[PDB]
């Protein structure tokens, strides 16, 4: 499976 | 909270024309909508006008409401009347925090006709008797108008203790209706050789008489 | 489906219609996008107005796609949500 | 069709706290205004309380602000009025209301009866009020109960036509008195049995009393 | 920051303000939420009108939770979008 | 990690 | 990359 | 504070096609309807199209239906014009509008010129005009060029008082001519020196001539 | 499409009150708004009036607009005049899909007084010349009203082959300009003895002369 | 359960 995640999120998962 | 204030009561002969006035005080009444409520004997209100002058289903060209701000009074007209729109209406506005009903209004129908009682009286049960208790209860119905006065005796003499009254109420015939209820020992009962229920009724009683078996 | 929840759609003065903008290769498949009725909006005597238009109103909102079943996206997408009526005095 | 359904009427003490619920059906309930209006026995219309659609906006007459408090369940198609230190003074019955905008009511409720008294709730005593040719009448007694109401019925329902249950007397005592009877043709009696049910759901009586002669 | 994109909060009949509803255990962190200005609404004139009402406009959105970092999820929650003006009379 | 998606998008995903 | 459990919610 | 900037504006032939652009900013440029107006060389203003905040509106004048497009680029803060089968009718000054609903346009832009001819263009021929006391007068011929427009500066800008470029002269030949001149001190001559810096950017032309005495 | 007439020019004296009157045709002026323009010689319109009568900033209460729907025109008025209000002045309207300008109108201001031209002629270039071409050019600038005759004359011979004017156009201070251009050849020029560029205004001729070096 | 590359997009 690969997932697509926005800039944006990328700086909220971290 | 400002306040309306509305007639206590209007009349009229049917066919005709009726107006009912609203006179709201503080703030102007052209800036919020009023509403007209109809309220029938027993029954839940009914929206009859909203928005100053709308009717929903069920309503008639016959109501209809209208305003007038150089008074500050909204007004709900009734043409062609009908005996069966015998209700209280109650008028109904706001302002930004309160929402305010009028004191409402008893709408009347002249040219009824008069209507004599129909009394009917029972004596006290078995069941009551056994339970060491005796009520003879009077069902006065159906006369016209609702104003009558209800006279307890035993044989002769008038009996004041014990009677307790209801005051007149509407029907599903328009016709008025009452009960009275006079509460006896079963000794008292038992002692007398009669009873009497005498409903006086514009001018003419009728008289209903139980005897113990 | 708000044409089942809430009815504002057809009692604003600025009106709009429901549309569904469905795909099933995105989650949510089917989106309720909201076109104004007209341009002008409903006055005080019910009546179309020109002196104010009716304008949509937009919102980002998250969505997952797939490819067509192995990889997933999560995008953010701009849709209208309603109508309000826009005037020049203030 | 616009249907308001309320409940939670009952007999409180002063100083007593009770919940008032209205289903609504027939219309998109999350988009409404609310309110809620009482009326005192004998009395007009007084408005309680207003909330808006979202629930967001609350508004409440000057009488029950701090004590009463109204809600919404836009999810559950309800709205709630959560009324506290009950007085006498709010002794009525609360209307639900479904209004267009704040202020403009379109609907009205039932109505459900709300009783605040230091007095304490008793169950009726029902009796038999034997038949009296034409047409012949009979009853049921529903002696002494509090509070109000009682739901006469005759043959489960079934008997609709001839029946008046006429109103209550509220005796000296402070209790309440009322009667029901039907106007049945003469030669009924002997053959179809009449039995009156009394229902007082504030005392949870249920009383089925089968009136016969006195022969 | 729609306070930065469209300025249409301010040009409604049915004006509106927004509100931070800030979170950093979720994704958006900050949503701007709106609260109308007034009951009433602007007319023609420029008065707040109270035959109408100024009503917030609701719409689901998705949005991601963590806890507080080892877990995550996705929740739909309702969010007002705008104002609208909403009439008796139609 | 551990992911908590909504009844609704268990439809979508199968 | 990271080993993803995943759970539904209703 | 708000500014409209349009470009894109020049020579083209007959059924020839052309995209204008207007760069804005001082505004949220996303919620607000846009305009193109025109007005042609010696007439009035004359309305050409409009469009929405959102784009999912779009309004043309009858002569320009189904050539002209309007589009814009919210999240770029411009708007566009995409002229196709240009007639010479088209030849005018096209501005840039801001309107607050559609109708009432709130703020207009510098314009740009477009030109519709079969003629191609030229490049002027720029000649110094020597000095004629008190104060003395020098300039420079700008000879023969077309389209419409020519950009006369003195000493790359520096120079301001005094200057006086008069509007162009539409020859029989079809081409332009226009003149500019200073009012200088007679003292000033042999000292300071003038140069004037004519533009063609039509045809590219810059032309930087020394104007000096011809004693 | 539907149209808006307004006055081809306006006139009047300083301090006075001036009215632009704007007619709409099909369609009624009280359902759309109405917005006025001004434009200055070169200049680019601008806002002057919108929304019917409101101003914006930069706009002194000497404008002011108005509108009467029971003769459906919009009126632009200036209250107290000055010379610097001289300008084109547009109407502008619409309807549900399109939109429509006035034909304006050109506002002038009376009591303005007449000022004699400022005739400058230029003779031909040493490279203009060196490039087998000749132009004497004159400038004629500050004058009032805009109304000057152009006549070019060689020794006295007059000569209408090669002349060009420029129409008048205000300035920067109210007053006009204009320029007339003769073209000739470098032999043309050396073969005359001299040449003269006269400007005739309001009755009166100013004379520019020039010769071969 | 599944493995999960995940990548950022701008």
Redesign the interface.
């Known amino acids: 499976?690969?997932?697509?995640?926005?800039?944006?999120?990328?700086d909220?998962?971290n | 909270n400002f306040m309306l204030t509305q007639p206590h009561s209007v009349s009229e002969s049917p066919g005709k024309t009726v107006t009912i006035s609203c006179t709201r005080s503080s703030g102007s009444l052209a800036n919020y909508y009023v509403q007209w409520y109809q309220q029938r004997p027993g029954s839940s209100p009914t929206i009859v006008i909203f928005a100053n002058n709308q009717r929903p289903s069920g309503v008639p060209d016959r109501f209809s409401g209208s305003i007038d701000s150089s008074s500050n009074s909204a007004s709900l007209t009734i043409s062609g009347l009908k005996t069966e729109d015998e209700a209280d209406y109650y008028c109904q506005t706001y302002d930004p925090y309160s929402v305010v009903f009028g004191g409402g209004t008893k709408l009347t129908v002249l040219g009824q006709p008069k209507a004599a009682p129909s009394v009917t009286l029972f004596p006290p049960s078995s069941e009551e008797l056994q339970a060491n208790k005796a009520t003879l209860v009077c069902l006065i119905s159906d006369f016209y108008p609702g104003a009558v006065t209800v006279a307890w005796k035993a044989d002769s003499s008038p009996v004041k203790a014990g009677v307790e009254t209801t005051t007149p109420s509407k029907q599903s015939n328009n016709k008025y209706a009452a009960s009275s209820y006079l509460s006896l020992t079963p000794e008292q009962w038992k002692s007398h050789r009669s009873y009497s229920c005498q409903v006086t009724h514009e001018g003419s009683t009728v008289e209903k008489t139980v005897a113990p078996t | 489906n708000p044409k089942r929840s809430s009815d504002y759609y057809n009692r604003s003065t600025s009106p709009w219609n429901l549309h569904r903008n469905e795909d099933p290769e995105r989650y949510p498949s089917v989106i309720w996008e909201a076109k104004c009725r007209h341009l002008g909006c409903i006055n005080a005597d019910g009546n179309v107005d020109y002196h104010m238009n009716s304008v949509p109103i937009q919102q980002e909102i998250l969505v997952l796609r797939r490819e067509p079943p192995?990889?997933?996206?999560?995008?953010?997408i701009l849709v209208s949500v309603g109508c309000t009526c826009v005037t020049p005095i203030v | 069709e616009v249907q308001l359904l309320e409940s939670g009427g009952g007999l409180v003490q002063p100083g007593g706290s009770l919940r008032l619920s209205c289903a609504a059906s027939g219309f998109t309930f999350s988009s409404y205004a609310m309110s809620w209006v009482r009326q005192a026995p004998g009395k007009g219309l007084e408005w309680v309380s207003a909330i808006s659609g979202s629930g967001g906006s609350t508004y409440y007459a000057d009488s029950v602000k701090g004590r009463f408090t109204i809600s919404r369940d836009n999810s559950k198609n309800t709205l709630y009025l959560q009324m506290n230190s009950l007085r006498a003074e709010d002794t009525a019955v609360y209307y639900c209301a479904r209004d267009l905008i704040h202020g403009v009511t379109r609907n009205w409720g039932q109505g459900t009866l709300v009783t605040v008294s230091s007095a304490s709730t008793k169950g009726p005593s029902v009796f038999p009020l034997a038949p009296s040719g034409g047409t012949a009448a009979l009853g049921c007694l529903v002696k002494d109960y509090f509070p109000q109401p009682v739901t006469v019925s005759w043959n489960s329902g079934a008997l609709t036509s001839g029946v008046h249950t006429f109103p209550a007397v509220l005796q000296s005592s402070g209790l309440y008195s009322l009667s029901s009877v039907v106007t049945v043709p003469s030669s009924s009696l002997g053959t179809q049995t009449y039995i009156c049910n009394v229902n007082h759901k504030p005392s949870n009586t249920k009383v089925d009393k089968k009136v016969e002669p006195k022969s």
Do not use: G, M, Q, Y
């Open positions: 499976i690969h997932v697509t995640i926005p800039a944006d999120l990328w909220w998962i | 192995n990889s997933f996206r999560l995008e953010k």
